[PDB]
Amino acid sequence: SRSYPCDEKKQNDSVIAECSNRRLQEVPQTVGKYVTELDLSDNFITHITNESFQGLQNLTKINLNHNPNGLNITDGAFLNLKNLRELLLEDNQLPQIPSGLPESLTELSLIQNNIYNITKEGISRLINLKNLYLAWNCYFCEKTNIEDGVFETLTNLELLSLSFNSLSHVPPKLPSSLRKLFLSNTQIKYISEEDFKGLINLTLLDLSGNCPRCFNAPFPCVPCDGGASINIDRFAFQNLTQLRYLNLSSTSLRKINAAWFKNMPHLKVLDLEFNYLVGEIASGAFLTMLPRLEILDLSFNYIKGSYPQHINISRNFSKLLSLRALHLRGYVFQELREDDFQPLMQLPNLSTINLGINFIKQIDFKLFQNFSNLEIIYLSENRISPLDPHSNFYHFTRPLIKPQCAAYGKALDLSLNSIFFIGPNQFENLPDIACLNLSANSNAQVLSGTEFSAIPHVKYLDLTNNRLDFDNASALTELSDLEVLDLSYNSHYFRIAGVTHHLEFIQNFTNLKVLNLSHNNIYTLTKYNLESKSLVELVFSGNRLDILWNRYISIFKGLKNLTRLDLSLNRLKHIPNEAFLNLPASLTELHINDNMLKFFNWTLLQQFPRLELLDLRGNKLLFLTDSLSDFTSSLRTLLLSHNRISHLPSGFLSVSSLKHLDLSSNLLKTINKSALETKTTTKLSMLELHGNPFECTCDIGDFRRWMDEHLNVKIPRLVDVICASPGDQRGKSIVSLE
Ligand SMILES: *[C@@H]1O[C@H](CO)[C@@H](O[C@@H]2O[C@H](CO)[C@@H](O[C@@H]3O[C@H](CO[C@H]4O[C@H](CO)[C@@H](O)[C@H](O)[C@@H]4O)[C@@H](O)[C@H](O[C@H]4O[C@H](CO)[C@@H](O)[C@H](O)[C@@H]4O)[C@@H]3O)[C@H](O)[C@H]2NC(C)=O)[C@H](O)[C@H]1NC(C)=O
Ligand SMILES: *[C@@H]1O[C@H](CO)[C@@H](O[C@@H]2O[C@H](CO)[C@@H](O[C@@H]3O[C@H](CO[C@H]4O[C@H](CO)[C@@H](O)[C@H](O)[C@@H]4O)[C@@H](O)[C@H](O[C@H]4O[C@H](CO)[C@@H](O)[C@H](O)[C@@H]4O)[C@@H]3O)[C@H](O)[C@H]2NC(C)=O)[C@H](O)[C@H]1NC(C)=O
Ligand SMILES: *[C@@H]1O[C@H](CO)[C@@H](O[C@@H]2O[C@H](CO)[C@@H](O[C@@H]3O[C@H](CO)[C@@H](O)[C@H](O)[C@@H]3O)[C@H](O)[C@H]2NC(C)=O)[C@H](O)[C@H]1NC(C)=O
Ligand SMILES: *[C@@H]1O[C@H](CO)[C@@H](O)[C@H](O)[C@H]1NC(C)=O
Ligand SMILES: *[C@@H]1O[C@H](CO)[C@@H](O)[C@H](O)[C@H]1NC(C)=O
Ligand SMILES: *[C@@H]1O[C@H](CO)[C@@H](O)[C@H](O)[C@H]1NC(C)=O
Ligand SMILES: *[C@@H]1O[C@H](CO)[C@@H](O)[C@H](O)[C@H]1NC(C)=O
Ligand SMILES: *[C@@H]1O[C@H](CO)[C@@H](O)[C@H](O)[C@H]1NC(C)=O
Ligand SMILES: *[C@@H]1O[C@H](CO)[C@@H](O)[C@H](O)[C@H]1NC(C)=O
């Protein structure tokens, strides 16, 4: 009773089927009639008829995106499905909206299609529709033909997205129940008082990309004639009292009318990126009309040809009492003084200040102490010196600073700047910084224990992509509370023959939990051993453990409390038995992937009683031990993908703790009865076997019966478990055979 070709999983008593990216020519008739959600996306399906979903009467959600990776849908093909609530038909090259859609539809997505006419024959009958997506249809068809009153009968429509279409004007006769109206990149150059007549429950309005400021856009960008901006009438948003989100990004706006926000007391998010509002930032009457605004974005509003000495922030900025995040990227100015940010120091909830990509040469860092609740100071891509159609295409939605860093406390990001060395006055007059990012600064500082004395409570320090010298035993030891140190891609700049690398600084830390020394080109150590009582995770990938491997046999033996160790990309051909035995016994996860290991001594796993995860992927191993149970009694996950293993030993499954065995992309031709003969019951939950040259002859029948007898062992990617021989069964799955 194993499902094929879908990976069926019971989620909240509703069986879902994941049949995506499986190279399916047609809709499969081998799907259980009890499934509710079906995902047939990224397949080569070309035709949809009224017999495709025959028998599956409990289908509440159908996904047919990117088919074929156009789609021919007959009239009333989905009409038989009386329980269909969600239908996704994105990127299907549909010329028109499918006629005969079921009335029980609540969410319809027709994004990235060739739909030029929005007619009543395919839309008006769908009165239960709550969400309607019609983006990227008549994008770059001179204009989208919207039938007058096509959305009138949809009295339950809460979301209408007509983005990236040649609309030219807001469609009239829209339902009053509309909560979110998306009109981004719609060529609507004029907004009138009558355009949004009866939208009293409208909480979101997106009018971005209309008369745009072309700044490295991922989609075509054509500005309005004569540098014109979007023409919004004085009383256009006078009836939208419940507006919370207003997106006016890339609208070439030069002046903001404060009268727009007179009847908008709940406006929480205002987007004004890619405009020409430098004058509005300096005076702005509209700043007094936004008392409940929490997110304000005025990024990339710079004036061409000018690089002002200071940022001109209006005193009216003090009237944004609810402000939490201020985004001011791309303003482009030379210096930030304490007096420039005076109208922001009294805002009680302002926790995020985004000043990235501003080319600031010097900052008066004492001004940050003047703030009350600052938690994120993002200053990346500046000049500080020593001492997807479902995406937000204008606002930076991803976390400015990594969540694992910001969780420790006050976060300051000084990455991609001109701090080529840590000056003596580098961090003076700074708040109590708990997260610091000095990444990609070409920093060649010879660390000695005094550089971070002004900010000694840094718990997460990111020093990636620099030329730092940390050979001194006192390096970084002034950060007594340091928990996470990131030194990835650190190329030493002052290498001493009998000194580099000297990792003695690590043992001084009483609370260092995670150390990342990846891609540091560590081929020699000098006190050669690494010791630490608090270290839990060490990343030593992209180093030269092959050159090191008898002075470096017990290299990580002193890390008595280490649970995670990454030894990938070290060019290891053969790990010495004495060196492997001297690895920390406390290890729970060991990653020796992407190396060149020809042999692995499985007997050595006896000295690691807590080892649950063993990663040996991307290697050249040919043999497996026939008595793995005699060496381990805790190994829950064993990853051996992309190896040269051609035979599974007798009783390899007969280790009890093993719940995940990955033998994909190997050289296994067949799984014989000796390897499957288990007297004791196995506890395996997942067995990956795709990418193997299986012989689909009578020899594979023994393993075929084991798959039917053991339905608890989930085998993923059944369509990728391909037979190499014979010519008749070549290409077919091992589950589809006599
Ligand atoms: C102009 O400005 C407006 C306002 O900021 C932007 O509107 C946002 O647009 C994006 C993209 O269309 C919306 O993002 C999507 O939201 C969906 C709903 O999420 C909410 O609800 C769930 C619970 O149902 C919560 O868990 C969640 O926190 C939210 O509160 C998500 O389902 C979407 O997720 C899917 O897509 C993303 C991106 O591919 C994936 O990363 C996810 O894994 C997932 O597959 C997505 O997040 C956003 O909600 C809109 N805001 C509002 C308030 O509606 C405009 O986009 C912007 N215009 C332009 C052109 O930039
Ligand atoms: C230098 O080395 C360090 C240490 O290895 C790296 O930092 C770690 O990077 C990994 C990712 O490579 C981080 O792990 C990820 O954490 C995410 C957030 O975790 C929170 O949420 C989960 C629940 O979702 C909680 O359990 C957890 O406690 C946190 O609250 C997760 O979302 C990620 O999960 C995804 O990947 C894993 C596989 O890795 C899947 O199993 C998941 O299903 C999911 O897809 C992931 O776990 C880790 O947190 C980082 N540690 C620190 C200390 O920051 C550096 O990135 C590295 N530097 C460079 C330049 O490479
Ligand atoms: C410290 O600062 C550096 C530099 O700003 C941070 O590195 C940056 O991290 C982000 C997020 O991981 C990367 O963005 C992503 O890049 C990929 C590839 O281009 C893209 O596909 C994603 O959509 C996204 O934009 C960014 O490239 C990377 N920058 C560099 C130069 O490597 C780092 O994360 C910061 N560290 C902490 C602790 O916050
Ligand atoms: C649909 O689900 C119900 C249980 O919710 C079940 O009784 C019924 O037989 C199912 N019908 C089909 C056709 O699967
Ligand atoms: C600040 O945020 C809290 C919620 O975190 C809220 O209760 C409070 O009213 C906000 N203060 C102001 C002045 O907006
Ligand atoms: C805060 O800034 C004001 C000037 O804007 C200054 O007089 C005051 O001393 C500063 N206080 C601190 C603690 O930085
Ligand atoms: C190493 O650091 C200590 C402590 O700051 C310092 O006294 C010493 O001079 C440094 N060593 C070298 C070689 O600079
Ligand atoms: C091991 O590491 C954890 C996390 O850093 C720490 O809390 C614990 O005290 C350490 N245990 C010993 C015995 O050193
Ligand atoms: C494993 O290592 C031990 C020494 O620790 C050695 O005696 C044994 O022969 C090795 N086994 C293999 C298969 O190399």
From Swiss-Prot:
What processes does the entry annotate via GO biological process terms?
canonical NF-kappaB signal transduction; cellular response to mechanical stimulus; defense response to virus; immunoglobulin mediated immune response; inflammatory response; innate immune response; negative regulation of interleukin-12 production; positive regulation of canonical NF-kappaB signal transduction
User: The LRRCT domain covers which part of the protein?
Assistant: 692-738
Its GO CC terms are: endolysosome membrane; endoplasmic reticulum membrane; endosome membrane; external side of plasma membrane; Golgi membrane; plasma membrane
Consequence of mutating residue 500 to A? Strongly decreases activation of NF-kappa-B
Consequence the record notes for mutating residue 302 to A: Abolishes responses to both ssRNA and chemical ligands
Q: Which residues are glycosylated?
A: 12, 50, 58, 72, 117, 201, 239, 247, 312, 316, 349, 370, 437, 472, 508, 516, 561, 601, 672
| Keyword list, A-Z | Disease variant, Disulfide bond, Endosome, Glycoprotein, Immunity, Inflammatory response, Innate immunity, Leucine-rich repeat, Membrane, Receptor, Repeat, Signal, Transmembrane, Transmembrane helix, Ubl conjugation
* Post-translation changes: Ubiquitinated by RNF216; leading to degradation by the proteasome.
> Outcome of altering residue 446 to A?
Strongly decreases activation of NF-kappa-B
Residue ranges of the LRR repeats are 83-104, 105-125, 128-147, 156-177, 178-198, 201-222, 242-263, 266-288, 292-314, 322-343, 349-370, 373-387, 408-429, 432-453, 457-477, 481-503, 511-531, 534-551, 561-582, 586-606, 610-631, 634-654, 657-678
The compartments listed are: Endosome membrane
Outcome of residue 469 to A?
Abolishes responses to both ssRNA and chemical ligands
Q: How does it sit in the membrane?
A: Single-pass type I membrane protein
Could you say how this protein's activity is regulated? Activated by RNAs having enough uridines.
Q: GO molecular function: any one?
A: RNA binding
Q: Which residues lie on this side of the membrane: Extracellular?
A: 1-738
Give the UniProt tissue specificity note: Expressed in myeloid dendritic cells, monocytes, and monocyte-derived dendritic cells.
Disulfide-linked positions: 6-19, 138-141, 211-224, 214-221, 405-435, 696-723
What is the similarity comment for this entry?
A: Belongs to the Toll-like receptor family.
Instruction: Give the function comment from the record.
Output: Endosomal receptor that plays a key role in innate and adaptive immunity. Controls host immune response against pathogens through recognition of RNA degradation products specific to microorganisms that are initially processed by RNASET2. Recognizes GU-rich single-stranded RNA (GU-rich RNA) derived from SARS-CoV-2, SARS-CoV-1 and HIV-1 viruses. Upon binding to agonists, undergoes dimerization that brings TIR domains from the two molecules into direct contact, leading to the recruitment of TIR-containing downstream adapter MYD88 through homotypic interaction.
- Subunit note: Homodimer. Interacts with MYD88 via their respective TIR domains. Interacts with UNC93B1. Interacts with BTK. Interacts with SMPDL3B.
What pathology is it implicated in? Answer: Immunodeficiency 98 with autoinflammation, X-linked: An X-linked disorder characterized by onset of recurrent infections associated with lymphoproliferation and autoinflammation in the first decade of life. Mostly males are affected; carrier females may have mild symptoms. Features include mouth ulcers, fever, poor early growth, hepatosplenomegaly, lymphadenopathy, polyarthritis, and non-infectious enteritis.
Task: Report the protein name in the record.
Answer: Toll-like receptor 8
Recorded name of the encoding gene: TLR8
> Which stretch of the intact protein is present?
31 to 818 of 1041
